[PDB]
């Protein structure tokens, strides 16, 4: 390629003109600095550094201390040093002669230095008598005259320091020799042997040779490495072809008479190691990690690359140019004859070429996505043990916390009755269900999820920090809005006075009005009051009421929830917020419910929460719960009661004890809310003075009621997650959880190439560049275990991960907290609840040939039971080859499955999965075809012991239209917007069963219940989404898995 470059002296073209040298030193009096001299200040530090033409200038010790730096550093004001550096730069000049000839250049370097020593030295005393000796027209000839007129052989100048305040001893001193011709250069360099420790480098500036002299041996390697770094950059732009200007071609220093460390250091610089992509551990302290790499190229790696490093270790006297690197000198030597270069040279073409490597020195923990296939064969490996977490670097907490919005803190979902009759035969049957259930309490395994996490516990840390923003910080609040009353409640113990509807005035002068103290039962009913004013009328924006109406809260308790609810309506006229409770303290009225005759209770809206108390017979339990509702229905018009154990007997007897009693009967509708504690199985009965006569009062199927009616007695026990800290290669049986630890960087790739047998996600990070420990975080997922322990072939991709060591696994400071429970939504949770049902059915039947799934991402292979059974996937879009090839026993026929009943051959032991039906491709909307394709789906079945499952979506009305909680799974008009796609058509459930009662034979619609909720929530260890939890239990019901299992 032969790179192009321009080589020209950089220092020579810095020296000013003789007749003009007047201005650039003293007559700098009239302007006043500002931009040139650069000064940064880290915080006990700083770096004041004046540059050209004041860099490479050494300070006279008389004018250094008196004018400035010593005292001004001792403190800086940006106004001090600008005025102050001027006061010094004013009183400076150089002994000079004003010339007429335009072809003259003033000699700075030597001239200024001589003045710095008061001319006491003869080299400075010579410039006193005749100062015109500094006026040179040609480089080299400048120094030549300062040798013939002295008889001296060499002049040595102590080096200049750029920093003005680092007043310490110099590391080295440069020396200029008298040398005109080429045959002269060979004399000094040969005589330069047998003399302490000296250095020269390739070319020279002014065409006179000048060598370096170091003080102590230790202060040689730090300068020798500071050059060798620079060169490795000049050959970067040259290697690619560009435009450089660094005059000399090779920056690398040449060690003449030297020690022993610099020999090992010089050879490892004169070959440009691939280690760029750097890796190398370059930053700090550099003179150490570079010195390690020298030992490397040595004993490894590698062939003639040792032979070359060992061909320069023993030599260490010639500079090793690389063909095209040599030609740049040849291109400039012919451009100008008479110019001095280092005589002893070696040219080598053999570099050669090899591997690439990778690294980064930035910030952030790197995420990984491991696979089950690669190019290596793993057979019988070690057990990669890791230990000790620590408490500062890795923190593990069992929660977890979530982050949401503001209004969605409150989210009610309404439900509506279905039946009109409560038969006399199933009323005693329903009774027996509630009686037998009450004795043995709800699942203990479900228990360690109710009393463990809580709504207020995870919702409340956020609203107390939007409180902080408030202290001094806020914008337009605007009355009534879901923000107004909330920041009014949770954020301030005092009152939020309103000035012109929207502004927050003013600031908490000195009184920080203690953050309104919240409690658990309060945010519980803070969520329901909004829903009551919402249920009154769909019209947005009220929250405050038309004045002179009284809302009475029944509880519970001698505490707030009423103090908050009152001062929200503080601004709007006269409103009464009264509270009653069995544990009610002044101001709130203490009374036992049912309350006595007399006292005359009266209100417009009643909220009723009573729960006292544990332990009693259902007979005593029934009588208490039923009587509280009756002492609430007569007490108000728009009243809502809270019933526990919504069992289809207890709940339905409530309607049965209000209808007959009340003239015109009564309109009922139970509801679930957000801020209810994810799965608390407690529902709220709502009671309103009808309009005429209700068509379907009672509850037939009872689905929300059923969520409670699926819990069960003791059996196995608590399951629970834990930590591991050990990995075995292709060895099954690992209890659900996660393992953290730390391993050596030299064996970090071996660790990763084994975690793939257990998980997918893994994070790794090194604490600091030069530590060697890389702690790993890996999450055990059962959705992966089914695709790993299939057969025996371990394989893996060991080769790829190994290209990270050392640096390449990320760097991270500070503390990091990983939770025990993570966070996941509902659509992949609803599928997680979907498969936990289907995995039960297929791992019970007699003989199977294969489990065949139709459509998808290949995912949902989980529930391939057993892991051995043939797994066929029929879809048009998927990645094939390697996974099917690596005998994980899979196959994918890329034909768009035609379910037109024209050619059907499922046959004997065929298990089919229809989670699709939406479309062949990403989106479909044909409901007669959903009926007709499901009609021609079951059509043509004479294939003996076969089975298949299909999924639905129906209902509509109760879950969205009267919902007003469009979180994630909202709907538009009759269209269901789940996740994305384009809203699928709802199917008539009544017709789909009725049309199925003549063609097919078997059709069982099983809904995923609470055992599926706990089991899937236990393995993956994923919290329920709270707001998503309220969508979960309703949306879960109306997606029935119709299993057509016939012959």
């Amino acid at each position: 390629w032969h790179y192009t470059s321009i080589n020209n002296d950089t220092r020579v073209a810095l020296d000013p003109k003789p007749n003009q040298i007047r201005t650039i030193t003293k007559p700098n009096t009239v302007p006043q600095l500002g931009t040139d001299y650069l000064y940064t200040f880290n915080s006990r530090s700083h770096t004041l550094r004046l540059l050209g033409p004041f860099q490479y200038f050494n300070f006279s010790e008389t004018d250094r201390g008196h004018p400035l730096f010593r005292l001004p550093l001792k403190y800086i004001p940006a106004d001090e040093l600008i005025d102050n550096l001027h006061s010094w730069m004013r009183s400076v000049h150089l002994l000079h002669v004003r010339s007429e000839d335009n072809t003259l250049r003033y000699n700075w370097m030597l001239g200024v230095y001589a003045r710095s020593t008061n001319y006491t030295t003869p080299v400075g005393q010579l410039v006193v008598n005749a100062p015109a000796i500094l006026n040179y027209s040609n480089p080299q000839d400048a120094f030549n005259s300062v040798f013939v007129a002295l008889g001296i052989d060499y002049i040595d100048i102590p080096i200049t320091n750029s920093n003005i305040f680092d007043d310490s001893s110099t590391p080295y001193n440069v020396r200029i020799w008298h040398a005109p011709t080429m045959t002269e250069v060979n004399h000094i360099l040969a005589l330069m042997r047998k003399s302490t420790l000296v250095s020269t480098h390739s070319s020279w500036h002014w065409n006179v040779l000048h060598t370096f002299h170091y003080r102590s041996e230790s202060d040689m390697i730090d300068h020798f490495a500071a050059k060798i770094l620079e060169d490795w950059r000049q050959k970067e732009k040259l290697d690619k072809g560009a435009l450089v200007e660094a005059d000399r071609v090779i920056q690398r220093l040449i060690p003449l008479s030297s020690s022993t460390y610099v020999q090992r250091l010089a050879a490892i610089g004169a070959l440009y190691p691939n280690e760029f992509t750097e890796n190398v551990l370059d930053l700090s302290r550099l003179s150490t990690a570079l010195l390690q790499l020298s030992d490397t190229y040595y004993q490894h790696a590698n062939d003639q690359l040792r032979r070359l490093y060992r061909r320069m270790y023993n030599d260490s006297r010639t500079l090793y140019m690389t063909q095209r690197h040599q030609e740049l000198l040849l291109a400039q030597i012919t451009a100008d004859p008479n110019i001095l270069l280092y005589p002893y040279t070696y040219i080598f073409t053999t570099i050669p070429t090899s591997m690439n490597y990778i690294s980064n020195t930035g910030q952030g923990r790197i995420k990984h996505s491991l696979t089950v296939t690669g190019a290596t064969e793993h057979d019988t490996v070690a057990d990669i043990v890791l230990g000790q977490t620590g408490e500062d670097v890795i923190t593990i907490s069992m929660v977890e916390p979530m982050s949401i919005a503001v209004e969605d803190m409150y989210g009610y979902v309404l439900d509506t009755p279905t039946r009109d009759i409560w038969p006399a035969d199933e009323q005693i049957e329903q009774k027996g269900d509630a009686v037998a259930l009450y004795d043995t309490k709800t699942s203990r395994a479900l228990g360690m999820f109710n009393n463990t996490v809580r709504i207020d516990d995870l919702l409340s840390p956020l609203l107390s920090l939007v409180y902080r923003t408030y202290i001094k910080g806020d914008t337009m609040t605007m009355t009534q809005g879901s923000l107004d009353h909330l920041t009014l409640c949770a954020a301030v113990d005092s009152d939020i006075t309103f000035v012109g509807n929207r502004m927050i005035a003013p600031l908490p002068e000195g009184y920080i009005p203690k953050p309104m103290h919240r409690n658990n039962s309060t945010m519980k009913m803070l969520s329901l009051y909004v829903a009551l004013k919402k249920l009154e009328n769909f019209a947005t924006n009220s929250y405050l009421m038309a004045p002179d109406t009284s809302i009475i809260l029944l509880g519970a308790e001698r505490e707030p929830a009423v103090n908050i609810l009152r001062r929200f309506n503080r601004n709007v006229s006269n409103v009464r917020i009264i509270g009653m409770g069995d544990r009610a303290v002044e101001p709130n009225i203490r009374v036992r419910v049912p309350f006595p005759i007399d006292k005359n209770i009266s209100a417009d809206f009643i909220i009723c929460d009573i729960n006292s108390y544990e332990d009693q017979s259902f007979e005593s339990m029934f009588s208490e719960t039923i009587s509280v509702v009756t002492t609430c229905a007569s007490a108000a018009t728009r009243a809502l009661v809270k019933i526990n154990h919504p069992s289809e007997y207890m709940i339905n007897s409530v309607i049965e004890r209000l209808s007959q009693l009340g003239g015109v009967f009564y309109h009922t509708a139970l509801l679930k809310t957000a801020s209810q504690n994810p799965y608390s199985y407690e529902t709220y009965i709502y009671i309103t003075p009808i309009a005429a006569a209700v068509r379907f009062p009672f509850y037939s199927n009872s689905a929300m009621i059923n969520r409670y009616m699926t819990a069960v007695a003791d059996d196995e026990m608590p399951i629970i997650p834990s930590i591991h800290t050990v990995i075995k290669g292709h060895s099954n049986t690992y209890s659900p959880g996660l393992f953290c630890g730390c391993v050596d960087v030299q064996s970090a790739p071996l660790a990763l190439s084994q975690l793939k047998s257990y998980c997918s996600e893994a994070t790794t990070w090194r604490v600091d560049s030069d530590d060697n420990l890389v702690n790993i975080i890996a999450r055990i997922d059962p959705a992966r275990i089914a695709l790993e322990f299939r057969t025996r072939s371990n394989t893996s991709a060991y080769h790829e991960y190994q290209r990270y060591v050392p640096n390449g696994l990320g760097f991270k400071v500070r503390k990091t907290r990983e939770f025990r429970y993570m966070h996941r939504e509902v659509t992949f949770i609803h599928k997680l609840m979907m498969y936990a049902l289907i995995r039960e059915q297929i791992s019970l039947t007699e003989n199977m040939t294969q489990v065949v799934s139709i459509g998808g991402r290949n995912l949902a292979d989980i529930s391939v039971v057993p892991l051995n059974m043939k797994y066929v996937v029929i879809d048009p879009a998927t990645r094939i080859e390697t996974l099917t090839q690596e005998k994980k026993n899979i196959e994918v026929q890329s034909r768009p499955f035609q379910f037109d009943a024209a050619n059907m051959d499922l046959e004997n032991n065929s298990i089919y999965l229809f989670i699709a039906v939406i479309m062949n491709e990403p989106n479909g909307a044909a409901t007669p075809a959903r009926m007709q394709m499901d009609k021609i789906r079951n059509v043509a079945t004479a294939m003996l012991t076969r089975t298949n499952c299909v999924a639905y979506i129906s209902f509509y009305e109760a879950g969205i239209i009267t919902r007003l909680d469009q979180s994630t799974a909202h709907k538009t008009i009759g269209r269901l917007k789940v996740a994305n796609y384009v809203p699928v058509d709802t199917l008539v459930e009544a017709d789909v069963t009725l049309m199925l009662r003549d063609i097919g034979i078997t059709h069982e619609i099983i809904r995923p219940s609470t055992p599926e909720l706990i089991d899937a929530c236990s393995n993956y260890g994923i919290r329920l989404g709270s707001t998503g939890g309220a969508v979960l239990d309703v949306f879960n019901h109306y997606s029935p898995v119709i299993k057509l299992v016939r012959s």
Binding site: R44, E61, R70, T120, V128, S168
Partner: protein
Amino acid sequence: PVEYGIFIQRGATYTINAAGEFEFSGRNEKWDQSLYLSEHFPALFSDVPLAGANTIIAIMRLFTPQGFLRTDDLAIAANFPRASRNPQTYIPYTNQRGTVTNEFASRFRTIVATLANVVNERAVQDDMQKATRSCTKQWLRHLETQFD
């Protein structure tokens, strides 16, 4: 005492690691002459800049010698025994043959100029009657003018 415990914190001595910077030992040792001809240095002369105490390090860049390594030809041109690879010495003065006011003495004035400033900070804490603080500042005038 407020920042002495920050200096003697990093170490009282140090060694030099093979090819690189210094290595301060976290120990607080008292110095002895037995260590001289062996290993280590008095770290109160190790001139790495510290991050906290910039006063203890300021009085130490005040011990810097003023001389030059005058390599002597006429001793080796006469052919004399020299044990080192090349001969060397260190004379401690200059010349100032034509300087108006001698340079070597003017450097001494900078020592007195800032060393006397440190003395005042003790006659504010013990707040001596001015006549006491003046009689010591007056002595440094006589001591310095003798050096001239």
